[PDB]
């Protein structure tokens, strides 16, 4: 029309159209399930490669060994948010000497995301991050969007074909919370496999897991221990 | 500092200069197989003496400056201009961590006037003159340099004058030295004169 010609120009929709374009970038991006227990927070992500003669690479990017992110959208844009996040963890360690409170940590990102949305025609960052963090309050799995608004979710799944993954989170909504850490990663791969059709099913190559928590640093398993978790199928009947 | 010698006596167009070979750091002469008389251009010489280490530092700073001005002119340097600019640059650099506290000697061939020799102190005071001396040696040399020409030099008397001074510098003043470079520069080619 002429109300998305910049992001300064307001829409008579109540939300600028340009904010909503940014939401499609994240949907077009990788299926990701993010769930938490009451000790650990787990990020299950789906890898993708840009060639046939290439071995798929993590869509879990490290913020640090205590707060970590999973990308849904552009890899570059996720990394751009990441660098700021990495700095905060580097300062948290100086000032507090604890893992930075996750809710605090998400609001500072939100402040940054807020800024191009204010500027003339400039791009809101078209990544959604599922942020897994462990602080003194407990584990937190947050949903961050292309707006400045963050949701604190029990379990949320964002990206492509994520509704089938989302009905799984609903079914075992109470279960994640009580469970042991190995099981928390197991429901995530079961949920993540639900996005894919009955035909297409998760294998060790395309599975990336980010586990953070009370007892341990952020570790990425790309074929490190993906396998025992991968075990048992349960897909959505399409 | 408070080591290292220079003397220059300007002639009819010639200028004869000598300085000792010897760069001593600590207690011993670190380099001696290099000379520290620099060609900043092929018409201009700076011979720096004081701190053995400090000479290269000053030379390089001038080397970029002298060329930037050359650009500006887009024709060869002017002697008047070289004394004042090098003086300003060096008094400001003395305070700087990249210091200067050298008694330098400008030899240039001037596009109009002719031969020019430019005096510089450690304190760094610019003067064109035709009877001047440098380094720790400047206190020692300058009255003598006042006396022996009438206006400017004559090379034969100068030669005798120079050999006589070079025994004195080793004798009274203390350098590590065992060779000296003696040079006359006519303004377009470097000539080697003999060591005593």
């Amino acid at each position: 029309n002429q109300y998305d010609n910049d992001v300064t120009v307001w829409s008579p929709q109540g939300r600028i159209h340009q904010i909503e374009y940014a939401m499609e970038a994240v949907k077009q991006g990788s299926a990701t399930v993010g769930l938490k227990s009451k000790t650990h927070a787990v990020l299950v992500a789906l890898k993708r490669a840009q060639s046939e003669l290439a071995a798929h690479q993590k869509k879990i990017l490290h913020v640090d060994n205590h707060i970590g992110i999973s990308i849904a959208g552009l890899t570059a844009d996720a990394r751009l948010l990441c660098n700021f996040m990495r700095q905060e963890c580097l300062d948290s360690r100086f000032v507090f000497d604890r893992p930075l409170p996750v809710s605090r940590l998400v609001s500072l990102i939100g402040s940054k995301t807020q800024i191009p949305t204010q500027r003339y025609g400039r791009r809101p960052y078209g990544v959604g991050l599922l942020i897994a963090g462990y602080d003194d309050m407990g584990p937190h799995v947050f949903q961050t969007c292309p707006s400045a608004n963050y949701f604190d979710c029990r379990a949320m799944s964002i990206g492509a074909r994520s509704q089938s993954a989302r009905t799984y989170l609903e079914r075992h909504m109470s279960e994640f919370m009580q469970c042991n850490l190995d099981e928390l990663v197991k429901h995530g791969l079961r949920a993540l496999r639900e996005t894919l059709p009955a035909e297409q099913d998760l294998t060790t190559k395309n599975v990336s897991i980010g586990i953070v928590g009370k007892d341990l640093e952020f570790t990425i398993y790309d074929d490190d221990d993906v396998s025992p978790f991968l075990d048992g199928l349960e897909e959505r009947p399409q | 500092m408070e080591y290292l010698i220079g003397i220059q006596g300007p002639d009819y167009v010639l200028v004869a200069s000598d300085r000792v070979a010897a760069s001593n750091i600590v207690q011993m002469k670190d380099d001696h197989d290099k000379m520290f008389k620099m060609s900043e251009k092929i018409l201009l010489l700076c011979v720096g003496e004081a701190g053995d280490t400090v000479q290269f530092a000053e030379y390089i700073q001038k080397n970029v400056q002298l060329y930037k001005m050359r650009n500006g002119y887009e024709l060869s340097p002017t002697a008047a201009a070289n004394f004042t600019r090098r003086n300003l640059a060096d008094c400001l650099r003395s305070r700087t961590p990249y210091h200067v506290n050298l008694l330098l000697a400008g030899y240039d061939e001037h596009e109009g006037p002719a031969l020019y020799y430019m005096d510089y102190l450690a304190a760094l005071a610019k003067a064109p003159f035709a009877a001047h001396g440098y380094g720790a040696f400047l206190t020692l040399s300058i009255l003598d340099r006042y006396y022996t020409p009438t206006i400017s030099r004559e090379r034969a008397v100068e030669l005798l004058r120079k050999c006589l001074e070079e025994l004195q510098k080793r004798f009274i003043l203390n350098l590590p030295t065992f060779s000296v470079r003696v040079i006359d520069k006519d303004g377009i080619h470097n000539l080697e004169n003999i060591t005593f």
Partner: protein, 201 residues
């Protein structure tokens, strides 16, 4: 022509000599001190004088040679690497810096060997030493000095100089480090133990 860093070039090849010992007086804490730094074969450096100042300028130089080499692809000038480092050293004073390093590396005219100070000296000589103990070293080396010395005379000349040095000014200990740059690519000869050198001379 001073301390435990010395390098002189000869007609067979080149010798590099260093100690690995630290602690004037009873005080000591470093026994495998790497005064001749060389993580790569392309450039070599030496320390001298003050412990902190050598190490600091040379780790900055460490980064600096690697960067030149990367940018040209082939290895650059020994002079350019060393001189970029010299501009930093003069400016570096005001930290109680008093760096006295000898820069060695391969230049296009041939081997280049240049003398570095914290007050910005740069002169090319056949022989350089940084510090205060090679003031002692110049008497036995100079007396016998030829620049066409045998590879074998030079190894024996270095070995003996540390042993005699230990006797004369104490400070050597643990290991004697010997390095030879032969052609234009360097090799570390041997990290020969102190106790052996004492007997030989």
């Amino acid at each position: 022509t001073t301390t435990l860093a010395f390098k002189f070039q000869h007609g067979v090849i080149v010798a590099a000599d260093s100690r690995a010992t630290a602690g004037p007086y009873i005080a000591s804490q470093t026994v495998k001190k790497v005064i001749e730094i060389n993580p790569y074969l392309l450039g070599t450096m030496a320390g001298g004088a003050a412990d902190c100042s050598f190490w600091e300028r040379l780790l900055a130089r460490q980064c600096r040679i690697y960067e030149l080499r990367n940018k040209e692809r082939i290895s650059v000038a020994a002079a350019s690497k060393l001189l970029a480092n010299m501009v930093y050293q003069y400016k570096g004073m005001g930290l109680s810096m008093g760096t006295m390093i000898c820069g060695w590396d391969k230049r296009g005219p041939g081997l280049y060997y240049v003398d570095s100070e914290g007050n910005r000296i740069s002169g090319t000589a056949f022989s350089v030493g940084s510090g205060s103990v090679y003031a002692f070293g110049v008497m036995d080396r100079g007396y016998s000095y030829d620049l066409q010395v045998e590879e074998a005379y030079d190894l024996a000349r270095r070995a003996i100089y540390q042993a005699t040095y230990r006797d004369a000014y104490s400070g050597g200990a643990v290991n004697l480090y010997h390095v030879r740059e032969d052609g234009w690519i360097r090799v570390s000869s041997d990290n020969v133990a102190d106790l052996h050198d004492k007997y030989t001379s």
